[PDB]
Design a protein around this nucleic acid. Structure first.
Lengths: 100, 127, 83, 99, 208, 110, 151
RNA sequence: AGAACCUUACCUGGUCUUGACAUCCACGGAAGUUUUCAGAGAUGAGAAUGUGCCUUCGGGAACCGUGAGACAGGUGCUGCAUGGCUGUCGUCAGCUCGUGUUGUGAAAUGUUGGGUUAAGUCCCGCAACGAGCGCAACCCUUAUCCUUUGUUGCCAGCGGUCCGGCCGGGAACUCAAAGGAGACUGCCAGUGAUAAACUGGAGGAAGGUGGGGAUGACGUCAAGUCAUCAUGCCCUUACGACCAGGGCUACACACGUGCUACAAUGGCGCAUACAAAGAGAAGCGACCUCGCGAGAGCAAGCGGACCUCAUAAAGUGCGUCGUAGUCCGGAUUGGAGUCUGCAACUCGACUCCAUGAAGUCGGAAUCGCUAGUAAUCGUGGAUCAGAAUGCCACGGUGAAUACGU
């Protein structure tokens, strides 16, 4: 991936980190069946006001080395291609070719 | 006094105990007719006994885990055979002839990348 | 469709604009991009030029259009025929 | 009783660790329960090995996380403390838990 | 892309791992990233120093690095001056207490990676690739390798049509798992393009 | 005691910040040490201490299977309160007398 | 195959009557590895058939089979420009199989409602020497007769 | 290994130009923290706090601000400049070399020949003698046994029982790993060239490579990939960067791969049995309560052989339907809704009620499979907020056939 994309991702992450407490609270408020209608409405509107990049469902998991969006693995934080390389080199602990 | 043999076939693992008695079979605290609804299964569990006339002579307590029905039955049979071998040690030849001493090593073949199954290749086309 | 408990959706800005229009009593078309906005009872009578991706297409709101959204009356694709 | 959960990727290493722990226990205290092997986690992974395209081309890796459950029945004064200074070999996550 | 990686196929048997730690699914990715970082840093730093293998090993929230290098003197510098310097930066990279050890590589002609690096260097300073390859092979043989292979590929002698050439000497069994096959690779960033250098060095078979 | 590893040191003939005995004196006083391991045959201890006063052998942060049987064996005499010392000792097990010259090339583990 | 002939795999006799042939038939009948259902169906067929013709369950079945077994089948050599169908004496193991298969096919075809019932009907037909399987057998024989010149 | 936004590379507008991302000085300000109006948003304008590590005080390192340029940036072009990685013939048994010899020489010989083998496998011969890479073996897994260790796993024999291994307990058995044993044509007979082997049988859990995987020789296709990454002309107030909306989901049509069907070896209803292998902390979420249901509420147990996902389904028994475009089939569409998510219009999944297309086994032709295989039945996992009939795994039931070349 590009540098720019990576930067964007980072920014998104930062935003998420920032706005988590508020956003979560808002969500809770919206959910809460034992609450006022007007309040709920306000909460809904409030959420809209907050930045979009603040959402965690905005950020894409990219490879930590290359930034490749596809072929990702969570345990390693790496795209398949890089993961394989790591494995070959001995750089991922415990990981070896499996047969059964 | 109770004699014993381990049973194993597919992913089943039977625990057959042989005792002297009248010939009542219990599988996981249930009768042979209750546990195995299938006739074939019943037949397979009775096979070894039929082969060596000790159906009326000995009771057997069984507990089996894993696999399905047929596999389980097979495992049980194997266990029984083992028990018999342990107990008499002069019926071995007959058992061998029958083909019951043999652990049936047929496991399910693993699925292989590329293929839809163990061997089914996906539909090919030149064009 | 949207959940009943959440209510109807309208863009805040759009709503504000509508309110302003109502206050005025004017009938100049309001150019809008909020295709996702639901139409409201108070919006009846107003012309509201909804974006279709390319251009703003005028939509005179009617009593029948209320439950619907603005994007329903502003078709995006432009297919005449194959021959 | 002190339950001890040894976890590692290398099995030999884990075994070595376990033995060491037992030794540590047995000199100071008395009645070490024993090194009980729990089930191993075989966390598998498939990946496409081509840079671009070839889907049937694949490598299937795995990480075998081994578990060793060591238990100590009588925690004395001398025994429990002995583990503080007694760190184990690297690449072996231990997890002691009294009661 | 025919061949399996010779190190990678043998990690369970005759070859060991480089990063040697346990971690749960939570902290594993992060750890990996850290390793990548530190290793990268080390490579950048100790380019002039002949470095073969960085072995990272982190127990108890503290990182233990082990640098295998042919000449410790240039990595250490004055006794505990350069190493110390390296350590703090390593720690920073990690975010934990660092500890650097330096293993001295006996026979750098038999270490494959080092050889590859040397070859790359030679290529960069505009020697005849073939002569370099020969030197690499010969030297290893002299030193007591049971066998060695080296391969170089692409834009050889700045030629328009790229090709690969390779020199083997002795025996280099790759299908045999118990064979100690030190494999490694490098890349010469020449004026005409990259020239990739592979080298396999067969130390001998392990019996267990 | 076989190998002693002090931090911020170049050779054994240097000197250190905040201590009395010089480094050859420290190595002699460590050569006199009396250790009793039980399980392993090669262990690594740790000695960390700051503050004004002597450094006994009882200040080594022991593991479980090592027993230091001389809690009045003196090693250092720390005089500066801003001085620290962090050595990592290595204790093998053998017999006879094996000296540094012969153990200069005998050691295989690089 | 080219390289090696192999020994036929072991087949267990059915639990009801203790017969290999019966078991084989059941297997043939079976679809999607649902053996049990198939065996039940077979049993049903037998019972009805037994009721109809008297005799035993097994004996009747055997008799039925006998009327649909082919002495001779044909195969395509085609050495010339046009194809020549050549007769060949069909071996004991194979003949039995073929008849069973034909019967099954007939059953599948048949317009009656339940599978078992259809099977029974087919069996009856075979016994009497009319029906579909028998016809097929005749056809097979006829072809062979026609091409008897080749041997 | 998952396009609503994001992803995104494309289009439409709105914007930025040493820049979203780095390094460097100059000099303005501690960073940051909170909040306000306009705007689709990007951005463009306001109100509160702070001055930490050190100064013969021309100031500093982190982190914002402005201008200059040096530069950044490019998923822009060339895979016919490349590395790396990948497919492929083909897991096909081949491909070579050194020295010797033959030939003016290209080359040959070895490597052919008699047998044999899965195998350039092995023997015997022989102007060859040797060697290497490969065909084999070493590795994982599966099939039998033994030793060790027994909780969170087990219950044979003992006592107690709420008839639940639940609780005293027991270490047997299963199981769990760790370490050993075992299979080598080793033993027997015959055939064979005094052979390599082959054919049978004995034992054995396993027999002739036991089953499966990993392992892919020299090379071939200027095969694929400059959009993973790296790397040897072009853009640099734009072929770079930010934003909102749209598109990648379009639809006369053609092809590929799948799922579901066309029914009775079945559909529906009620009862009821037997798995394996996995995942789980911004996570899996019992029980209980409410909801026809998707779910909702409350909320334990659990980084997990313990708790949760989690009822396996086919099956079995009893009933019903009786060959109908049907109590087959479920597309399509209407209504109403649940959850995720700032957000389900374009364009999510799932639920309920209604609706009930085509389809009655498919032309020419064409694919897979030799055994726990095909066929069929469910189960799990990765990516993942949500979003699989795909992919990768797991067990259940479980065939037919191989005369032969």
């Amino acid at each position: 991936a590009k540098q720019s994309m990576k930067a964007r991702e980072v920014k998104r992450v930062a935003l998420a980190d920032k706005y988590f407490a508020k956003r979560a609270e808002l969500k809770a408020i919206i959910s809460d069946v034992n609450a006022s209608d007007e309040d709920r409405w306000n909460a809904v509107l409030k959420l809209q006001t907050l930045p979009r990049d603040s959402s965690p469902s905005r950020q894409r998991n990219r490879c930590r080395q290359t930034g490749r969006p596809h072929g990702f693995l969570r345990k390693f934080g790496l795209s398949r291609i890089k993961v394989r390389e790591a494995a070959m080199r001995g750089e991922i602990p415990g990981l070896k070719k499996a047969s059964w | 006094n109770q004699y014993y043999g381990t049973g194993r076939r597919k992913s089943s693992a039977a625990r057959v105990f042989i005792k002297p008695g009248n010939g009542k079979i219990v599988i996981n605290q249930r009768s042979l007719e209750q546990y195995f609804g299938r006739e074939t299964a019943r037949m397979v569990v009775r096979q070894p006994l039929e082969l060596v006339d000790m159906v009326e002579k000995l009771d057997l307590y069984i507990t089996v885990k894993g696999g399905g029905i047929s596999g389980q039955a097979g495992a049980i049979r194997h266990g029984i055979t083992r028990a018999l071998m342990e107990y008499d040690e002069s019926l071995r030849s007959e058992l061998r002839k029958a083909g019951f001493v043999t652990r049936d090593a047929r496991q399910v073949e693993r699925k292989k990348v590329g293929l839809r199954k163990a061997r089914r290749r996906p539909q090919f086309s030149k064009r | 469709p949207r959940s009943l408990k959440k209510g109807p959706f309208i863009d805040l800005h759009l709503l504000k604009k509508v309110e302003k229009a109502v206050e005025s009593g004017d009938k100049k078309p309001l150019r809008t991009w909020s295709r996702r906005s639901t139409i409201f009872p108070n919006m009846i009578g107003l012309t509201i030029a909804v974006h279709n991706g390319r251009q703003h297409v005028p939509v005179f709101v009617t009593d029948e259009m209320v439950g619907h959204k603005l994007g329903e009356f502003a078709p995006t694709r432009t297919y005449r025929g194959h021959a | 009783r002190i339950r001890i959960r040894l976890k590692a990727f290398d099995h030999r290493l884990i075994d070595q660790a376990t033995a060491e722990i037992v030794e540590t226990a047995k000199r100071t205290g008395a009645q070490v329960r024993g090194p009980i092997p729990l089930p191993t986690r075989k966390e598998r992974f498939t990946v496409l090995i081509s840079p671009h395209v070839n889907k049937d081309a694949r490598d299937q890796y795995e990480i075998r996380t081994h578990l060793r459950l060591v238990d100590i029945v009588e925690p004395t004064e001398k025994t429990v403390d002995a583990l503080m200074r007694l760190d184990l070999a690297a690449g072996v996550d231990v997890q002691i838990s009294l009661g | 892309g025919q061949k399996v990686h010779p190190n990678g196929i043998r990690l369970g048997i005759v070859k060991p791992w480089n990063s040697t730690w346990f971690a749960n699914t939570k902290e594993f990715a992060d750890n990996l990233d850290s390793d990548f970082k530190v290793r990268q840093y080390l490579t950048k730093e100790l380019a002039k120093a002949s470095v073969s293998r960085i072995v990272i090993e982190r127990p108890a929230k503290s990182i233990r690095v082990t640098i295998h290098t042919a000449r410790p003197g240039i990595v250490i510098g004055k006794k505990g001056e350069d190493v110390e310097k390296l350590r703090k930066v390593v720690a920073d990279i990690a975010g934990v207490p660092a500890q650097i050890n330096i293993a001295e590589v006996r026979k750098p002609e038999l270490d494959a990676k080092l050889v590859a690096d040397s070859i790359t260097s030679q290529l960069e300073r505009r020697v005849m690739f073939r002569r370099a390859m020969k030197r690499a092979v010969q030297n290893a043989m002299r030193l007591g390798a049971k066998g060695i292979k080296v391969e170089v590929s692409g834009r050889l002698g700045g030629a328009e049509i790229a090709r690969t050439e390779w020199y083997r000497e002795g025996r280099v069994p790759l299908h045999t798992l118990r064979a100690d096959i030190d494999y490694n690779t490098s890349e010469a960033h020449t004026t005409y393009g990259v020239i990739g250098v592979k080298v396999w060095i067969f130390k001998g078979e392990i019996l267990g | 005691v076989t190998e002693v590893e002090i931090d911020g040191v170049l050779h054994e003939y240097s000197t250190k910040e905040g201590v009395q005995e010089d480094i050859l004196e420290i190595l002699l006083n460590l050569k006199g040490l009396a250790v009793r391991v039980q399980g392993k045959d090669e262990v690594i201890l740790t000695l960390n201490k700051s503050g004004i006063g002597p450094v006994t052998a009882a200040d080594i942060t022991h593991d479980g299977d090592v027993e230091i049987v001389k809690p009045q064996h003196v090693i250092c005499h720390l005089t500066d309160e801003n001085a620290s010392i962090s050595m990592r000792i290595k204790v093998q097990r053998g017999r006879g007398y094996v000296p540094a010259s012969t153990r200069i090339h005998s050691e295989e583990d690089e | 195959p080219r390289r090696r002939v192999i020994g036929q795999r072991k087949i267990l006799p059915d639990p009801k009557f203790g017969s290999e042939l019966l078991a084989k038939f059941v297997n043939i009948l079976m679809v999607d590895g649902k053996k049990s259902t198939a065996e039940s169906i077979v049993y049903s067929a037998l019972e009805t058939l037994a009721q109809r013709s008297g005799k035993s369950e097994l004996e009747a079945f055997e008799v039925a089979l006998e009327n649909v077994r082919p002495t001779v089948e044909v195969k395509s050599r085609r050495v010339g420009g046009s194809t020549y169908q050549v007769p060949v004496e069909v071996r004991p193991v194979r003949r039995n199989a073929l008849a069973m298969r034909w019967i099954v096919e007939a059953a599948r075809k048949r317009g009656d409602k339940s599978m078992a019932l259809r099977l029974a009907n087919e069996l009856s037909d075979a016994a009497e020497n009319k029906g579909t399987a028998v016809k097929k057998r005749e056809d097979v024989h006829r072809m062979a007769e026609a091409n008897k010149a080749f041997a």
